[PDB]
Design a protein around this nucleic acid. Structure first.
Ligand SMILES: Nc1ncnc2c1ncn2[C@@H]1O[C@H](COP(=O)(O)OP(=O)(O)OP(=O)(O)O)[C@@H](O)[C@H]1O
Ligand SMILES: [Mg+2]
Ligand SMILES: [Zn+2]
Lengths: 115, 52, 83, 98, 128, 155, 205, 60
RNA sequence: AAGAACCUUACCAGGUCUUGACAUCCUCUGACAAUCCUAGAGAUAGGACGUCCCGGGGCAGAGUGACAGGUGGUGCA
RNA sequence: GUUGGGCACUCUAAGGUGACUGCCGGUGACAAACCGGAGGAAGGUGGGGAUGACGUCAAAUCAUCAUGCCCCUUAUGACCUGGGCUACACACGUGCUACAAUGGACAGAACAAAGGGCAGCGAAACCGCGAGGUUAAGCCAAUCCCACAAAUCUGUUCUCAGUUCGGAUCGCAGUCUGCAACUCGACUGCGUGAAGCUGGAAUCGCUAGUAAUCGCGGAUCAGCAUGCCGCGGUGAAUACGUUCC
């Protein structure tokens, strides 16, 4: 069940399997099925080549997988290049949306290195 | 760390031609269980493993 | 985040300074305290010395900066790591 | 009809004041809708008892606004006078709508 | 027609019960009790005063009930029924009182107390 | 407490089986005051018990508890250097309490996907007394018998 | 940090508010005018033995009733001083002020008067022991069932401050029905502030 | 509060957003109750004296 | 702390002031002012426009030296 | 409940009644008192709240306020912009959300209490996927509004996975408040989808409408709470006992 170069789970309902492509979430998926008139409830393994064909055409109009990864990477490269405050936070591994850093912020900083 | 359940069997029956090894045998194995298979030779211990 | 209806905000006292520099095609270092001012296209090429709390930091404005706030390029806190 | 709303912090003067209102209208002859006891409002303020720190030490005060409604049915011209002529003690709010 | 009234109260709920000659139909706010009260356990408890007096099928219980939850309303309907039965027949008083159906369960939500997180629940304590 | 024994609390008999024991188990299964969930679990379990065994669910359940309820428990006592486990008889009420508690806890640990199925299997095992809950009862009886010497000690 | 103000505990139970008016929208405005009026009366009548100042309101009127032990000194000759006060309060409030003076018959039963009297004596370098003991006798003669007095601070210019209290008869502070008057006062000495607390118990209600 | 601070707060600031409340008895900036325009401390002091109409100690 | 974007705010950098941002005196005089235009980041200046409310009940400014002023220290006064 | 009509019932709130070991039996000194019973809504200070003795800790606060003494006075006072109080190798306290099937998602039927509202609450209608927006009814309020309570129940789907669990972080695009959301706001949409599989030593709260869990409101407040103060909904387990801390 390869779509946009991603082998979507065959056993899962269509709405859910679509979300395995980088750049598609639950709502996005429902629209694609809505636009392409496919039932959400059918399992991916049970999809006909026609329905699969239709889904693939619609998904080509969205920015997914490498496309999206390249777009977002440029955004990060842009912020640092212009020497923004946000750029500095990104490269330094600190919160960029004003979260306090005295406590928490372990998603950005990684595991504690006690001293 | 992983999840609780790892093996479940419901109404599990294994036959060879006309010989029933075991029939309607429900059991489970959870994470971290240390299970000893007890039984005489030929009772099907290795058979169950190959099924698992 | 500023409502689109309101439009981008930029302290007029700073915009006025840039309009005079643009009419004469001149490029002086404009000292400002308006960290909150949006970078408009009109600023491109100029050098604005933005107060960071103790000194005006000259920040060169490139095209890629338009829409950000002046303050965004003049960090106010000093930190070179613990040790 | 003539609608009277009495408010007060002290229900006692409220009852005393309301009594004066009802009798003066009834002696004027107009029928009186007995003073309706409306739900008492209760605002509560919890404040820090101490001047500094000691967050767990609080003190609670409340203000209870008692209300009464007096409707006057079948009014008379002399009644309207008697209603305004009454001097009810300070601390009772009188509202006369008609 | 001939009807016997009873006020019952549980927690926040108040139930105005009227016993009328009928066949055991409970209508609460113009609905079959099953629609209003899902729980089977609650419906069993509600009927309890009727069972103890062996009056199931004698009376239609018309209940107007407001406030509180579906378990408090159930409690209030039961209490109102017991009191209504007293009017129908003073002889029932002994059995109802023995089973504790005439007592108003006076348990009410305790107020929250400053410095505590509920009525009793104290905040986590630390020596160090 | 020091003053003296305190009034225990009554439970109403279950609406379907007219049993106080069933009602008590329902309370033991309940979490976060959600009595609805627990009643549904138990009724579904009893259907599995009747549908599986064919016997009456209540009879199976009562037989299971009989096999779980302990008669002698052990109470710890610090006697000088070493701590002694003193065997003590289990009050009838406590026997029921321990049975339901042990049943519920070990049922939750089983490997079936749903609690009702889990609970059903656990009760069936206790009916044949071969489940975890049974084992717990074996352990306490072993401890009491082993430390039978120290029964003399007591408060 | 132990004993609730005896008056606070009994307000609305047995004791009434001095401010006896109701307001809605204007509540904040009215409250603060009364604060300025009370302060003004306290200063202008600091020597006139003014215990209690009740304040009423009506439309634009303000009916002030000042309770004093020395009504003569507040009214003045032919109402000269009381008319002067009216004019001063009409200019502050910007309202029509009416003033009534009530005579306190037994000056020594009013906790505020007593607290102020003792404070004046502490400022005149009278022994704190004598001041308190003398007052307590006078008050008990007036028929109070009990009295407690306390003076705190640098008693006789000591380095280490302490409190010394004297009592007579019964002062049941914990009895909510007991009409227990209470009042504080401060004395400014060369060594700083001496606190004065007075409790007077005049019987049950 | 410094007399300067009470004066600044009583003047109209550059912007309406900059207006804030102080207890107008003692000048405390924190814990000012709109209904009374008093800080927590002044409120208690005057309540105990019976000088806050219709306020009494709460219990229930 | 029952609400740190400015304010709050007491801290720091920079730009500023000195009967003073706040108060009672003294005196002189008479409105102060508001409102814009220009300059400034703003405080502030520069101009402009009017130019006292009822002996002073006042209100205001200008000078004047008494003073003000401190969330400065000591809660072990 | 809309109109007429009524206030019966509920409810609202003033004044009353009620609980006193007052009565019955035993025990006890015959005393105090204790154990049980009746009646009753309630039985042994019914439940909760307020109320905190003499003193202790030279406890806390000179930063609410006030104040002795000392110190500064073209400055330790006063004004202004910007910044900081939000920093971040790291340790601790108190919380929130979770690790899932007694659950997630979707849909339907319900059921509260208590409080707030005049420059305030703001309906209905219309627009937007949404935060919101236009217009604007009603209400200075037992009337109008905030205001749809949520768990729960009933169906459908998911089928044990780091997932349709979990929501951090981050990218993009927006809304509202405000002179102004860069440092440093809340919320929304799209995308992204971290740790986390019930937690070592140890340690905390709670004796019943309590714990646990589910929502709702309020103060502060232009805006901003997982905090604080209140409200109800569902609603347990256990107390044998005083050997031990
Ligand atoms: N394909 C087969 N056909 C028929 N009989 C078989 C077959 N495979 C196994 N058996 C018999 O069935 C039983 C299964 O043997 P298996 O090796 O699976 O288990 P076991 O005897 O428990 O193991 P162990 O080798 O550990 O003793 C033995 O009797 C074996 O002889
Ligand atoms: Mg083998
Ligand atoms: Zn104050």
């Amino acid at each position: 069940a390869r779509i946009a170069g991603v082998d979507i789970p065959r056993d899962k309902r269509v709405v859910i399997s679509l979300t395995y492509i980088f750049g598609i979430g639950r709502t996005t998926a429902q629209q694609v099925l809505k636009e392409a008139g496919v039932s959400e409830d059918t399992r991916v393994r049970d999809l006909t080549e026609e329905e699969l064909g239709k889904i693939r055409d619609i998904i080509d109009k969205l920015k997914v997988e490498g496309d999206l990864r390249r777009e977002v990477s440029l955004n990060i490269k842009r912020l640092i290049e212009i020497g923004s405050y946000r750029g500095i936070r990104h490269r330094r591994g600190l919160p960029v949306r004003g979260q306090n850093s005295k406590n928490n912020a372990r998603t950005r900083k990684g595991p504690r290195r006690t001293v | 760390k992983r999840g609780k359940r790892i093996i479940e069997a419901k109404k599990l029956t294994k036959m060879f031609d006309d010989r029933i090894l075991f029939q309607d045998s429900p059991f489970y194995i959870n994470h971290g269980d240390r299970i000893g298979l007890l039984g005489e030779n030929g009772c099907g211990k290795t058979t169950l493993i190959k099924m698992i | 985040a500023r409502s689109l209806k309101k439009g981008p905000f930029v302290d007029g006292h700073l915009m006025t300074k840039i309009e005079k520099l643009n009419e004469t095609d001149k490029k002086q270092v404009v000292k400002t305290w308006s960290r909150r001012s949006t970078i408009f296209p009109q600023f491109i090429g100029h050098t604005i010395a933005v107060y960071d709390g103790r000194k005006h930091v000259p920040v060169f404005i490139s095209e890629d900066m338009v829409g950000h706030k002046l303050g965004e390029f003049a960090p106010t806190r000093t930190y070179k790591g613990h040790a | 009809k003539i609608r009277i709303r009495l408010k007060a912090y002290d229900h006692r003067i409220l009852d005393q004041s309301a009594e004066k209102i009802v009798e003066t209208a009834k002696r004027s002859g107009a029928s009186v809708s007995g003073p309706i006891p409306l739900p008492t409002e209760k605002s509560v303020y919890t404040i820090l008892r101490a001047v500094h720190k000691y967050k767990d030490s609080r003190e609670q005060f409340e203000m209870r606004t008692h209300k009464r409604l007096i409707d006057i049915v079948n009014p008379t011209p002399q009644t309207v006078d008697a209603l305004m002529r009454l001097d009810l003690p300070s601390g009772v709010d009188i509202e006369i709508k008609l | 027609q001939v009807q016997y009234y009873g006020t019952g109260r549980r927690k926040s709920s108040v139930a105005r019960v009227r016993l009328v000659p009928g066949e055991g139909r409970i209508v609460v706010n113009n609905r079959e009790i099953s629609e209003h009260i899902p729980s089977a356990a609650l419906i069993e408890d509600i009927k309890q005063p009727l069972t103890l007096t062996e009056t199931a099928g004698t009376y239609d219980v018309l209940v107007n009930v407001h406030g509180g939850g579906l378990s408090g309303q159930a409690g209030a309907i039961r209490h109102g029924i017991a009191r209504a039965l007293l009017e129908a027949d003073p002889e029932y008083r002994t059995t109802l009182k023995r089973a504790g159906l005439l007592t108003r369960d006076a348990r009410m939500k305790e107020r929250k107390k400053y410095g505590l997180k509920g009525a009793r629940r104290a905040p986590q304590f630390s020596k160090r | 407490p020091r003053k003296g024994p305190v009034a225990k609390r009554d439970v109403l008999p279950d609406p379907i089986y007219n049993s106080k024991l069933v009602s008590r188990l329902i309370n033991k299964m309940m979490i976060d005051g959600k009595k609805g969930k627990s009643q549904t679990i138990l009724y579904k379990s009893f259907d599995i018990i009747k549908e599986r065994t064919g016997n009456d669910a209540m009879e199976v359940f009562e037989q299971a508890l009989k096999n779980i309820m302990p008669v002698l428990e052990v109470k710890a006592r610090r006697v000088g250097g070493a701590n002694y486990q003193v065997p003590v008889e289990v009050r009838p009420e406590r026997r029921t309490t321990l049975g339901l508690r042990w049943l519920v806890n070990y049922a939750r640990l089983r490997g079936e996907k749903t609690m009702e199925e889990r609970l059903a299997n656990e009760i069936l095992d206790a009916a044949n007394n071969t489940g975890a809950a049974v084992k717990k009862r074996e352990d306490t009886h072993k401890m009491a018998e082993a430390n039978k010497a120290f029964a003399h000690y007591r408060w | 940090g132990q004993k609730v103000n005896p008056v606070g505990l009994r307000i609305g139970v047995i004791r009434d508010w001095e401010s006896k008016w109701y307001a809605g929208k204007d509540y904040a405005d009215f409250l603060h005018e009364d604060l300025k009026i009370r302060e003004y009366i306290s200063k202008r009548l600091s020597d006139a033995s003014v215990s209690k100042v009740e304040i009423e309101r009506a439309a634009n009127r303000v009916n002030i009733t000042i309770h004093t032990a020395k009504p003569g000194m507040v009214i003045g000759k032919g109402g000269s001083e009381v008319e002067a006060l009216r004019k001063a309060l009409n200019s502050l409030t910007g309202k029509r002020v009416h003033i009534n003076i009530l005579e306190i018959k037994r000056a020594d039963l009013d906790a505020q008067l007593v607290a102020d009297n003792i404070a004046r004596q502490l400022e005149n370098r009278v022994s704190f022991r004598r001041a308190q003991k003398q007052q307590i006798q006078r008050t008990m003669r007036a028929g109070a069932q009990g009295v407690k007095t306390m003076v705190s601070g640098r008693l006789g210019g000591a380095d280490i401050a302490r409190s010394e209290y004297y009592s007579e008869g019964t002062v049941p502070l914990h009895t909510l029905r007991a009409d227990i008057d209470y009042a504080t006062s401060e004395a400014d000495t060369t060594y700083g502030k001496l606190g004065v607390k007075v409790w007077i118990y005049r019987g049950e209600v | 509060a410094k007399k300067s601070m009470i004066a600044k707060q009583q003047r109209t600031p550059k912007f309406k957003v900059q207006e804030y409340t102080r207890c107008e008895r003692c000048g405390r900036p924190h814990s000012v109750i709109r209904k009374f325009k008093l800080c927590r401390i002044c409120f208690r002091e005057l309540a105990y004296k019976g000088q806050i109409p219709g306020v009494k100690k709460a219990s229930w």
